[PDB]
Design a protein around this ligand. Sequence first.
Ligand SMILES: *[C@@H]1O[C@H](CO)[C@@H](O)[C@H](O)[C@H]1NC(C)=O
Ligand SMILES: *[C@@H]1O[C@H](CO)[C@@H](O)[C@H](O)[C@H]1NC(C)=O
Ligand SMILES: *[C@@H]1O[C@H](CO)[C@@H](O)[C@H](O)[C@H]1NC(C)=O
Ligand SMILES: *[C@@H]1O[C@H](CO)[C@@H](O)[C@H](O)[C@H]1NC(C)=O
Ligand SMILES: *[C@@H]1O[C@H](CO)[C@@H](O)[C@H](O)[C@H]1NC(C)=O
Lengths: 50, 43, 164, 98
Amino acid sequence: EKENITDPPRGCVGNTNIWKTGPLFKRVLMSSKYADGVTGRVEFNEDGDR
Amino acid sequence: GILTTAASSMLEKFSYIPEAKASCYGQPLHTLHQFMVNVTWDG
Amino acid sequence: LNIAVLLGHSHDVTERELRNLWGPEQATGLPLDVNVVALLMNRTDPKSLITHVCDLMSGARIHGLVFGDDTDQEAVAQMLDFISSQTFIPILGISGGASMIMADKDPTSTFFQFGASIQQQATVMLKIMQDYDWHVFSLVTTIFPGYRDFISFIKTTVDNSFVG
Amino acid sequence: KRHGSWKIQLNATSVTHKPNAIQMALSVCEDLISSQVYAILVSHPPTPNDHFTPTPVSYTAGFYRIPVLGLTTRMSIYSDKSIHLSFLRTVPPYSHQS
Ligand SMILES: *[C@@H]1O[C@H](CO)[C@@H](O)[C@H](O)[C@H]1NC(C)=O
Ligand SMILES: *[C@@H]1O[C@H](CO)[C@@H](O)[C@H](O)[C@H]1NC(C)=O
Ligand SMILES: *[C@@H]1O[C@H](CO)[C@@H](O)[C@H](O)[C@H]1NC(C)=O
Ligand SMILES: *[C@@H]1O[C@H](CO)[C@@H](O)[C@H](O)[C@H]1NC(C)=O
Ligand SMILES: *[C@@H]1O[C@H](CO)[C@@H](O)[C@H](O)[C@H]1NC(C)=O
């Protein structure tokens, strides 16, 4: 739902830089609230765990 | 100097310390991990 | 012994003076076969890292590894730690991302950095704060990890401090 | 199925057990850098290497900061996000049992 979405490239050929929205995507994964789950309701804590 | 110091200080104790791995494809006790706790190189 | 010094850098220093940096040295030579492998790498992607490490380990069984860096990619050294988890070779990290502080090493690893831990750096900073008698302070951290060990070390150091 | 009429699609990529961990790292690094995957999951409990090490996958994807989702491993040494730069898991480690 946002702009500034880059792509992690084929890093083996001339790409030593990091992916730019790495921590942004990781923060989206940290802030991912859920209310549906087969094993149960899943939510990430401050340690990124169930 | 640290590497040669550890190798020379352990070589006096045991000789067959260099025990490497041949290659990554197709896959020792006396090691330098716990021996070089101290080191001395030109003071 | 057989030691490979690889430099993934952008600071232009050639490699033959690295051979001369060993050549007239080692006055008391106790090993009888010591070789230097001075290599310069321009791209530090992990495919080429593991490829050159496997080539040098197949390169007449090199027993020593020294790696320097001028970038800010710390996990390469952690990559070397994984190499240190598998190749059973003592690995040294010089500077840049090769020696940025990782938290806990492994008995399965023999990796080492050339730097100061965050605990010893906190000890130096508290020594600085003690030498100016700046006895009142406030500790401010974000949720960037390593903060709990930082707070616990500072509290145990203040509990072992003559300052009050 | 239920995710709108947008043109996005999802391809599957899976690699299996190898007894040699360096060649595990080789299979993971080539087969996932050459594929441009955006999310990587690890589901290998039953290894003869009983140290439970998904470390090369985590380090390789955290080089370019790609998230690795642990699914069965429960060691609290993976909770350090400063070592494992892009590792998360939805299973509790044993320390949370405390
Ligand atoms: C993307 O980044 C640019 C940088 O200038 C910023 O202006 C823009 O607001 C960002 N996109 C969003 C969040 O709409
Ligand atoms: C635990 O299991 C139940 C079903 O027995 C379900 O409500 C959900 O998966 C979990 N709810 C909790 C946390 O009690
Ligand atoms: C270093 O350790 C060795 C082995 O214990 C010992 O023989 C030597 O005296 C030590 N040297 C110094 C100066 O600590
Ligand atoms: C720079 O790196 C490339 C890629 O490995 C290599 O082919 C070339 O020989 C390197 N040049 C130097 C100065 O080592
Ligand atoms: C999807 O991945 C498979 C396995 O690598 C590959 O054979 C296939 O060509 C891919 N298809 C797409 C969407 O490119």
